[PDB]
Design a protein around this motif. Sequence first.
Motif, PDB file in Angstrom:
ATOM      1  N   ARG A 174      27.881  42.887 -15.450  1.00 16.19           N
ATOM      2  CA  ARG A 174      27.350  42.515 -14.225  1.00 16.19           C
ATOM      3  C   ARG A 174      27.060  42.341 -12.925  1.00 16.19           C
ATOM      4  NH1 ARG A 174      22.739  45.433 -13.533  1.00 16.19           N
ATOM      5  NH2 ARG A 174      22.706  43.008 -12.635  1.00 16.19           N
ATOM      6  N   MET A 175      28.397  41.641 -12.111  1.00 16.35           N
ATOM      7  CA  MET A 175      27.601  40.956 -11.303  1.00 16.35           C
ATOM      8  C   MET A 175      26.567  41.225 -10.365  1.00 16.35           C
ATOM      9  SD  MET A 175      29.477  41.451  -7.608  1.00 16.35           S
ATOM     10  CE  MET A 175      29.068  40.858  -6.763  1.00 16.35           C
ATOM     11  N   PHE A 176      25.587  40.027 -10.392  1.00 14.63           N
ATOM     12  CA  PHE A 176      24.184  40.377  -9.312  1.00 14.63           C
ATOM     13  C   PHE A 176      24.817  40.521  -7.873  1.00 14.63           C
ATOM     14  CE2 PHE A 176      21.470  38.049  -5.556  1.00 14.63           C
ATOM     15  CZ  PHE A 176      20.848  39.248  -5.899  1.00 14.63           C
ATOM     16  N   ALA A 177      23.777  41.810  -7.719  1.00 12.16           N
ATOM     17  CA  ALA A 177      24.011  42.341  -6.290  1.00 12.16           C
ATOM     18  C   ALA A 177      25.533  43.079  -5.612  1.00 12.16           C
ATOM     19  CB  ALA A 177      23.130  41.773  -5.151  1.00 12.16           C
ATOM     20  N   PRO A 178      25.943  44.069  -7.032  1.00 13.54           N
ATOM     21  CA  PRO A 178      27.288  44.273  -6.160  1.00 13.54           C
ATOM     22  C   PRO A 178      27.727  44.451  -4.796  1.00 13.54           C
ATOM     23  CG  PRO A 178      26.394  45.457  -8.659  1.00 13.54           C
ATOM     24  CD  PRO A 178      25.460  45.182  -7.723  1.00 13.54           C
ATOM     25  N   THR A 179      29.101  44.741  -4.612  1.00 12.46           N
ATOM     26  CA  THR A 179      28.876  44.880  -2.952  1.00 12.46           C
ATOM     27  C   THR A 179      29.748  46.143  -2.660  1.00 12.46           C
ATOM     28  OG1 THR A 179      31.455  43.692  -4.366  1.00 12.46           O
ATOM     29  CG2 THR A 179      30.080  41.777  -3.035  1.00 12.46           C
ATOM     30  N   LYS A 180      29.078  46.829  -1.502  1.00 12.00           N
ATOM     31  CA  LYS A 180      29.482  48.089  -1.792  1.00 12.00           C
ATOM     32  C   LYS A 180      30.199  47.772  -0.260  1.00 12.00           C
ATOM     33  CE  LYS A 180      26.612  48.624  -4.687  1.00 12.00           C
ATOM     34  NZ  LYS A 180      26.112  49.613  -5.800  1.00 12.00           N
ATOM     35  N   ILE A 181      30.542  49.354  -0.298  1.00  9.49           N
ATOM     36  CA  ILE A 181      31.851  49.479   1.455  1.00  9.49           C
ATOM     37  C   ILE A 181      30.344  50.161   1.920  1.00  9.49           C
ATOM     38  CG2 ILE A 181      33.056  50.408  -0.216  1.00  9.49           C
ATOM     39  CD1 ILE A 181      32.285  53.241   0.737  1.00  9.49           C
ATOM     40  N   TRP A 182      29.403  50.094   2.413  1.00  6.56           N
ATOM     41  CA  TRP A 182      28.620  50.700   3.148  1.00  6.56           C
ATOM     42  C   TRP A 182      27.752  49.353   4.126  1.00  6.56           C
ATOM     43  CZ3 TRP A 182      27.404  53.068  -1.459  1.00  6.56           C
ATOM     44  CH2 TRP A 182      26.784  52.408  -2.347  1.00  6.56           C
ATOM     45  N   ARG A 183      28.302  47.565   3.708  1.00  4.33           N
ATOM     46  CA  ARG A 183      28.346  46.850   4.404  1.00  4.33           C
ATOM     47  C   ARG A 183      28.716  47.032   5.980  1.00  4.33           C
ATOM     48  NH1 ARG A 183      28.656  40.948   3.010  1.00  4.33           N
ATOM     49  NH2 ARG A 183      30.269  41.854   0.812  1.00  4.33           N
ATOM     50  N   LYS A 184      28.165  46.550   6.737  1.00  3.37           N
ATOM     51  CA  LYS A 184      28.509  46.614   8.326  1.00  3.37           C
ATOM     52  C   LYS A 184      30.222  45.936   8.304  1.00  3.37           C
ATOM     53  CE  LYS A 184      26.463  47.061  12.832  1.00  3.37           C
ATOM     54  NZ  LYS A 184      24.868  46.286  13.297  1.00  3.37           N
ATOM     55  N   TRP A 185      31.210  46.625   8.282  1.00  4.80           N
ATOM     56  CA  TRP A 185      32.130  45.528   9.267  1.00  4.80           C
ATOM     57  C   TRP A 185      32.761  45.051  10.216  1.00  4.80           C
ATOM     58  CZ3 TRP A 185      33.561  42.806   4.440  1.00  4.80           C
ATOM     59  CH2 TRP A 185      33.102  43.806   3.471  1.00  4.80           C
ATOM     60  N   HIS A 186      32.706  46.589  11.144  1.00 10.52           N
ATOM     61  CA  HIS A 186      32.082  46.359  12.514  1.00 10.52           C
ATOM     62  C   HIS A 186      31.489  46.472  13.781  1.00 10.52           C
ATOM     63  CE1 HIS A 186      35.783  49.159  10.266  1.00 10.52           C
ATOM     64  NE2 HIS A 186      36.776  48.738  11.341  1.00 10.52           N
ATOM     65  N   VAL A 187      31.689  45.402  14.832  1.00 14.78           N
ATOM     66  CA  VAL A 187      30.329  45.182  15.242  1.00 14.78           C
ATOM     67  C   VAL A 187      30.574  46.260  16.584  1.00 14.78           C
ATOM     68  CG1 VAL A 187      29.489  43.097  16.739  1.00 14.78           C
ATOM     69  CG2 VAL A 187      30.514  42.334  14.139  1.00 14.78           C
ATOM     70  N   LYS A 188      29.614  46.134  17.140  1.00 14.14           N
ATOM     71  CA  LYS A 188      29.800  47.108  18.564  1.00 14.14           C
ATOM     72  C   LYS A 188      29.764  46.328  19.849  1.00 14.14           C
ATOM     73  CE  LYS A 188      26.889  49.715  21.467  1.00 14.14           C
ATOM     74  NZ  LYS A 188      28.044  50.044  22.593  1.00 14.14           N
ATOM     75  N   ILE A 189      30.058  45.636  20.420  1.00 16.06           N
ATOM     76  CA  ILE A 189      30.363  44.870  21.806  1.00 16.06           C
ATOM     77  C   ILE A 189      30.114  45.283  22.676  1.00 16.06           C
ATOM     78  CG2 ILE A 189      30.732  42.882  22.777  1.00 16.06           C
ATOM     79  CD1 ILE A 189      33.124  42.812  20.103  1.00 16.06           C
ATOM     80  N   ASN A 190      29.572  45.339  23.683  1.00 15.34           N
ATOM     81  CA  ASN A 190      29.076  46.148  25.377  1.00 15.34           C
ATOM     82  C   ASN A 190      31.197  45.879  26.040  1.00 15.34           C
ATOM     83  OD1 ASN A 190      26.349  46.787  24.678  1.00 15.34           O
ATOM     84  ND2 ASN A 190      25.428  45.569  25.921  1.00 15.34           N
ATOM     85  N   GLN A 191      30.772  47.034  26.279  1.00 10.29           N
ATOM     86  CA  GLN A 191      32.706  46.990  27.179  1.00 10.29           C
ATOM     87  C   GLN A 191      31.740  46.051  28.595  1.00 10.29           C
ATOM     88  OE1 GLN A 191      33.805  51.033  28.376  1.00 10.29           O
ATOM     89  NE2 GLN A 191      35.324  50.395  28.241  1.00 10.29           N
ATOM     90  N   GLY A 192      31.695  46.054  29.243  1.00 12.72           N
ATOM     91  CA  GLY A 192      31.002  45.154  30.222  1.00 12.72           C
ATOM     92  C   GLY A 192      31.068  43.489  29.637  1.00 12.72           C
TER      93      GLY A 192
END
Lengths: 260, 203, 133
Positions: free
Chosen positions: A46-64
């Motif tokens: 098993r690799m060290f710290a296996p990657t997960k799907i609940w990583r933050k993929w999307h970034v919230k940006i202010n509409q302004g």
Amino acid sequence: SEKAGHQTSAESWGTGRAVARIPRVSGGGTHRAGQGAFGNMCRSGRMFAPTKIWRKWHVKINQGQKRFATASALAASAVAPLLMARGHQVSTVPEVPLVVDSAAVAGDAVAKTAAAYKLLKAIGAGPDVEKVKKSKKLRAGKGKMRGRRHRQRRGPLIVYSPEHDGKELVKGFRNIPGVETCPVDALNLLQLAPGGHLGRFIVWTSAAIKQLDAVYESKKGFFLPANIVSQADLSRLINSTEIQSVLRAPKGEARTKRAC
Amino acid sequence: NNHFRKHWQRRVRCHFDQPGKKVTRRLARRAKAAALAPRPVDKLRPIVRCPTVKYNRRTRLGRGFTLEELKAAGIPRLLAPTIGIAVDHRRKNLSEESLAANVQRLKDYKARLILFPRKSNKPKKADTPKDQQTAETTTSLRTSFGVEQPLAPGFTEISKSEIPAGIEGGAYRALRKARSDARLVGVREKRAKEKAEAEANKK
Amino acid sequence: MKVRPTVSSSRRKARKAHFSAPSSVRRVIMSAPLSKELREKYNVRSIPIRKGDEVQIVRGAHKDKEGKVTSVYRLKYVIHVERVTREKATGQTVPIGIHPSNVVITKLHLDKDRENILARIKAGREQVAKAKG
RNA sequence: AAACUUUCAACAACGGAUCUCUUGGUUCUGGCAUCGAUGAAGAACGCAGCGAAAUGCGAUAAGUAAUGUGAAUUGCAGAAUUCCGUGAAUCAUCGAAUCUUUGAACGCACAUUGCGCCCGCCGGUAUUCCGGCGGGCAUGCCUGUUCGAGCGUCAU
RNA sequence: CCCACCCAUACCCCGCCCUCAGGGUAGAAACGAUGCCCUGAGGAGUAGGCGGCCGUGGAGGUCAGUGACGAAGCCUAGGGCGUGAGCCCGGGUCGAACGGCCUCUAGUGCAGAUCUUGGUGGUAGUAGCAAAUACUUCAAUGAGAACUUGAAGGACCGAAGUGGGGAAAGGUUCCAUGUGAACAGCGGUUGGACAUGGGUUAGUCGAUCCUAAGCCAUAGGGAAGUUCCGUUUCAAAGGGGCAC
RNA sequence: CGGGACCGAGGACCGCGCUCUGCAAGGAUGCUGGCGUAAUGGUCACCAGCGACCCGUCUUGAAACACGGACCAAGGAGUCAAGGUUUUGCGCGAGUGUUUGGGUGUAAAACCCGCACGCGUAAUGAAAGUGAACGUAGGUGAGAGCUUCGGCGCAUCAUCGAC
RNA sequence: AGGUUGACCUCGGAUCAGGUAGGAGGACCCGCUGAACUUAAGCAUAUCAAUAAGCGGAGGAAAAGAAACCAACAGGGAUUGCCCUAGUAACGGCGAGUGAAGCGGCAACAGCUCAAAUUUGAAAGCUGGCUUCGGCCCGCGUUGUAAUUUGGAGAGGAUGCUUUGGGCGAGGCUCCUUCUGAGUUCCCUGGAACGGGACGCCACAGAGGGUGAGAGCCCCGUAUAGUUGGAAGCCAAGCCUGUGUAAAGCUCCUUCGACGAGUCGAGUAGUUUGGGAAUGCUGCUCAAAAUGGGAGGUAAAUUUCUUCUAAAGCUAAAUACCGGCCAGAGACCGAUAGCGCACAAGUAGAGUGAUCGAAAGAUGAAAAGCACUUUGAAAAGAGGGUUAAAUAGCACGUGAAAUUGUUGAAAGGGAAGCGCUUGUGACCAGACUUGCGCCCGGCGGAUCAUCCGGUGUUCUCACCGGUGCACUCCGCCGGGCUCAGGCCAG
């Protein structure tokens, strides 16, 4: 996969005189028996710290801030030095921003790719379209295996008004490589600043130019921002008589003589 | 305060299917509208006032019209769910105002309703005639019959000739007095009964 | 650019389909263009190649060689053309595999089914031309 | 001086790193609801002209019928196809079929290719003997039919 | 007690590198002003703190980038640049892709972990191949014969056998023909090895039948249940005969 | 007044000066020779003089002891998520946050929409409850900057008051 | 005949006529049962956890569900799910910790069926068998099958108006099918163009793949409207006909208005919950009522009030999904990675067994996989061949290091290796080769200066066309001169 490197039965052989205390696959009669398991340093483990799907993929940006950036990119698109600095070929363009009459794009006028191509060569986007045509290259790396085989430059972006110009110009301009189309009311920063670089070459229609003011007057909660600098010409500000008349005499030159 | 002392990774929910679920919901709504055409996609909802003292300043759409509202609007309770009116038998009308507002809402809907006959070659008297069957129609009762004024108007103008005099003694004093009588309502009654018993004993 | 959701642009799936296609699919894959005279006669651009066709090779080291198709060997996606062979060491002749896209058909082996194919392709092309014109 | 040991270089070895490739994984998204006593999933044994396996199939056995396409399959051998056609193919589709011994597994058993019973048909001199073939014989429960038992309640 | 002499990274002078500090630099003939010019001081370092840069896989933009007239990789007592991590070139090999710049991103940098997997040395042509008494001659075969065969001799097992047959277990090892390599810790023409074929015939021999120790259905009772007990039971558990 | 060694930083002029046609005065020029290539320079191997313990870990104050290391290639260890906190950059600002959802789309992107809601705009008390101006939002001493040169005095600090 | 003849009830038999259940799968779902590691300094409350393992039962979803609800408001109004409520109310040794709900916004919306009544002027209801398809029988059932009623009501009256059944159906949608644009034009390199150059063409198609190297136009496909042929469903504008025997709705009302029992509730015990004062479930004991009963989160009595109406039942959607089937994708991995498995992988192999469980991809575009000769018993070797390449020979792309052989060079009196600095030998990168400016002589041309016209500009500077007639400009060729030029030195 969450179970990768963990579908083995293995126990450590304990502290002794011979081998390291890594867990080893039990049993016998095969090469896997006695081999290390479960470790990130082990083969088939098993690799060290296996990657997960609940990583933050999307970034919230202010509409302004999004609207601010879109306004800044559109302001940079009307500066001809920045168009050349972004690698666009605009030396034969009669005027920036380039505005074409809506009679040449409305209805089925440029519904054919040949007609759209001829209109581009007439208005002066032809050298930039040819640049995109000649810049096609094969990708360096594994993106070729992963569906991204070719790379090319970005051509002109035609901004139109769907209410007055229709939507057949999209079909007309689709097959030309590098040529992108966008409605005036849904402008995209990923298109206006490709790669975070300002100065996209834009072909406007007259209807889109007429509707742009209504587009920024219909955005609730947003106004066109106030600049912190009123005069951007620092040379004019510094060499104006108002500042120069109150300055002290210079205490030296650009170069200083060596004393001793 | 982090609650990660259970096997939390076994039931982590991600939402990558949010745009796909929006697409699925829009396709389902389009299919429902196409199946229901030319009827609206939803039912007419009454206007009700939210419970508790926090939300009783605002109105919203309720479940369905009461039987008293349907009777006062002249719509039979078996016909009402067949012509786009939601019916709620649990709700009652404790005051005239909500009843009258919902009855006027039902009358407006019935005035704007076009009713096609069950058989085209045999129209009835309750059905809309063919020369009036054609008009510009709506497909969203939640939009066409929304809550126009959820809150009362926050600003009104009057002349200084008609400024009210106000509660005598002051609003703060009125509130303190009302709280005082609310707390002392039992004590006054008990002493009144004691005084009445003493007067009856020594009259 | 593809628009339909049933169309895949996956290179892995495309190569798997191409190299695991059955024989009837490989027949359609192993198509050859017609000569200019045949195209103006039949209003047909391409047809699957079969045994008995006359072909001229237009690509490769055996260019401008003409001959009859003696085998359509679909297992390695090649055809064999008569007299287009090489010599093994022992002096015998072994055929040289040519891909059908490297040849042009000069004479069709005509029968009822081939005429049906040509007629329906020509009719489809004509009705497409009338619809789009 | 050579040999020997070590170092440096070229070439040759040993070994399979690196680079490039990928009919494969991994993750996400969309759609769908369909196993079985009308015998499933699983197991065993067989089947090709020349195969052990993988794949496919069941004594109609790398398969049959039907529909469609329209000239192959291929490693060898042997045959094609009236090519102006009820028609090649290790082709596709698939609505008709076949579907060995088993298995919830169902006559009783099974560590046995063990032992039966019921009813027909056929053959061998055969009212009796022998052999073969076909159809059947599990349990619980439901509805109904029919045959019964009991002073359990009655009429007569 | 005296005179001279030797030399530390110490002290003095000079050059250069970095750091810190103090100044200058626009009616701009004006500058990677994040630059350049002038001046002074300082320079060890564990735990620890901070800054800048180099390198790897992938993403956007850009260089109208390189490339079958040779990309990547690899070898190199051949060079150039950088304090350095590194970068670039020449030569040889090779065969299909890859790189520079700015942003974005990470499964991103190894000498150790009795680390994992794989491969390879010295030891070393070394330890050793010494229980079961033992071999020899001629001929044939064959490229080749101590360990193949025939004959000729010499011996051993010594009937609780190194003999003749079975039970368990194995499964074709049995027989004939042929045989390169591998295996038979030496050899091998030989072989239980390898290759192609052949071979196991029952009313009387076994199994099949019986019951033993024991095990499992059924009635019925437990148990949430997978199932447990029960094997003669608190079961309507069936056979025969006669009939005008 | 001799004899010797090492060094030549800078790059139009500007300055201090002097012995003043000029100069040794804010840093080397002038004259001449041989060679013009492996001659100088560099890399590699080796000899020679001098110098020079085998690395990592552990321990305590330190050594020593002890542990790991036959060799090489590839793999190999402070990551991700949630919640806080301080600091930096950005947008808006007494407001702020579109993205639960809806509309739209060239369709997991981008663009658009608003009700509620969260945080902030008021605190205190166990609670019931009550709830922030005597004054140019106060006085005094400092305090950058400005000034009409009399003072006005930001942030902030100390102190006395008010609610 | 009455010691007979029967009707019922209960319990049996049958290879009786017709059916049904079992097992698999189990990611998601409904229940049962149920830990420990862990976290609390240790540790019997607690936490992990009402979880893992074990057992039973379904479906494409399941479950829940149309209030014995929430509330306390001007009242909302079945269920499910998302956001918020909220890390809040509340629970907790010696504290580590735990932790909902009402409202509010949204997605999606859909409502109903019995028991308790006499059809009583007519069991009007139903399984099965035989049918000539009209029906006729054996029965079930009155210890109750139909119609009617379900609390929102209803039953009975009054009252006057409304409502209904069938049959076609244009057209549309869903699913398989036929068919679709344009260069193999010329030149170079190459074994092969799909590379470079030139000339074109198509594009609602410049996605992808193949083809002897990077192909929009060679091939398959790709885009868009359609266009052939076929099947089965659904939706549907409209159009023909019967009309009231019967059913149904609305309005009003004196009266009537049945409403689920070992159940609710109480005590006790175990378990569970935030509900260790207010939770749910189960076992034992007690055991109801008729404006009654439940609830109103602090125990009790009295008087009120507000909400529903339990102990019977059904029902789509929004929601879940590491199982199955089909499909499309990715800033993912690139053969020690990625699933254990890219290969005849859950295979070979091990274990009595439960189980454990690998290693292993790449010649070349095409086998063209080396004819023939020669030497060897053979394996093979050498010539000679194939190929663009064997420096690609089924040990096969590339071919690192450790380690080994040969050749060349060197060193070596009980370690080598390393730093500073010379020397020797071997091997190398640079630098240089001449430039600039004058004075003469000889050539070869007028893009010398001025002026004129046009044009552009920074508006006073330039370009273009005429004009130069060779003491002026521009190159070239021979000399001579000055300066600057490489290395080491005096």
